[PDB]
DNA sequence: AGGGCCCCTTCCCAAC
DNA sequence: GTTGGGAAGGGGCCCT
DNA sequence: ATAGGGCCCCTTCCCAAC
DNA sequence: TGTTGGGAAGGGGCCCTA
């Protein structure tokens, strides 16, 4: 369930997820694309890469017809139609539409 | 409880008794206050470091020249003039840096 | 218990 | 100054 | 044999000085 | 302009004491 990496000593969660993390140290990339033969450290990244060769964006917006490569990217897009800005800075009260936009504002100062 | 997940951000915090310290990063609580300048701190060890401003203590002394410094990074920087050593080196560039964060922002800033 | 698969985060940087 | 696509990496969840 | 406080180490970060 | 660097923020290991 939880284990420390023998190289970086950071805690890795999830059973069987340690070899995947160690590949970020060793750099080994077992999964290879059948077309461009670019190698990848993880299988889910290679699967996403194969869609780049076809241009497939399977997740479509119901309102504007916009296509996205990831289903969670489509949920981020729905905020354009709903106008919802769920992230807010408790010091400024300024709102954002993505979490990293709020994270960028907090690491600054003078706010 | 050498390892525990924070009840707020669900991230793993290591070390016994280290969770309330991490919780204060969420709440902003500053229970440690310098009684001279009234500046508040979230951690006791950060208060001790701040006390050196008033005591003038420079506990980091060089073993060769004997110069005293207030922070460990001052001594490490000062050791460079005794050595000439630049300790951090990229391998996809063989470019040399003086601090660790200089190498990190070089491996993540376009370029090579 | 470990493999797919997906969700989620920040970082970079460009379009706007 | 705001938005967002791509990518790296971590963790939850399902199934066999 | 153990848990918590103190203490000091390390890192990346912003961003200003050089 | 690029490079250097001071200090903040935060996480983790070691030691001492109960
Ligand atoms: Zn590691
Ligand atoms: Zn390919
Ligand atoms: Zn839409
Ligand atoms: Zn704000
Ligand atoms: Zn937390
Ligand atoms: Zn003070
Ligand atoms: Zn010296
Ligand atoms: Zn390089």
The DSSP code sequence of B28-53 is ----EE-TTT--EESSHHHHHHHHHH
Instruction: Identify residues of A whose CB sits under 8 angstroms from chain B CBs.
Output: 2, 11, 13
Residue B10 has, within 13 A of its CA and on its CB side, a CA count of 1
Inter-residue contact B39 to B50 (CB < 8 Å): yes
Instruction: Identify residues of B whose CB sits under 8 angstroms from chain A CBs.
Output: 3, 12, 14
Closest CA to A97 of A85, A82, A109: A85
Residues pairing with A88 in the sheet: A95
Residues pairing with A12 in the sheet: A3
| Distance in angstroms (rounded) separating the CA atoms of residues A1 and A17 | 9
Helix (H, G, I), strand (E, B) or coil at A36: coil
For B26-41, b/e burial (b = at least 16 CB within 10 A) is eeeeeebeeeeeeeeb
| Distance in angstroms (rounded) separating the CA atoms of residues A21 and A26 | 9
Q: Give chain B as a DSSP string.
A: --EEE-TTT--EEESTT-HHHHHHHHH----EE-TTT--EESSHHHHHHHHHHHH----EE-TTT--EESSHHHHHHHHHHHH----EE-TTT--EESSHHHHHTTTTSS--
Q: Which residue is nearest to nucleotide D9 (CA to C1')?
A: A21
Q: How far is the CA of A111 from the C1' of C15 (A)?
A: 26
Experiment used for this model: X-ray
């Amino acid at each position: 369930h939880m284990q420390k990496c023998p190289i970086c000593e950071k805690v890795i969660q999830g059973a069987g997820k340690l070899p995947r993390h160690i590949r970020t140290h060793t750099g080994e990339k077992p999964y290879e694309c059948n077309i461009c033969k670019v190698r990848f450290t993880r299988q889910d990244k290679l699967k996403v890469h194969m869609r780049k060769h076809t241009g497939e964006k399977p997740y479509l917006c119901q309102q504007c017809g916009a296509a996205f490569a990831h289903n969670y990217d489509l949920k981020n897009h729905m905020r354009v139609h709903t106008g919802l800005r769920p992230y807010q800075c408790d010091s400024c009260c300024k709102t954002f539409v993505r979490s990293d936009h709020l994270h960028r504002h907090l690491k600054k100062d003078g706010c």
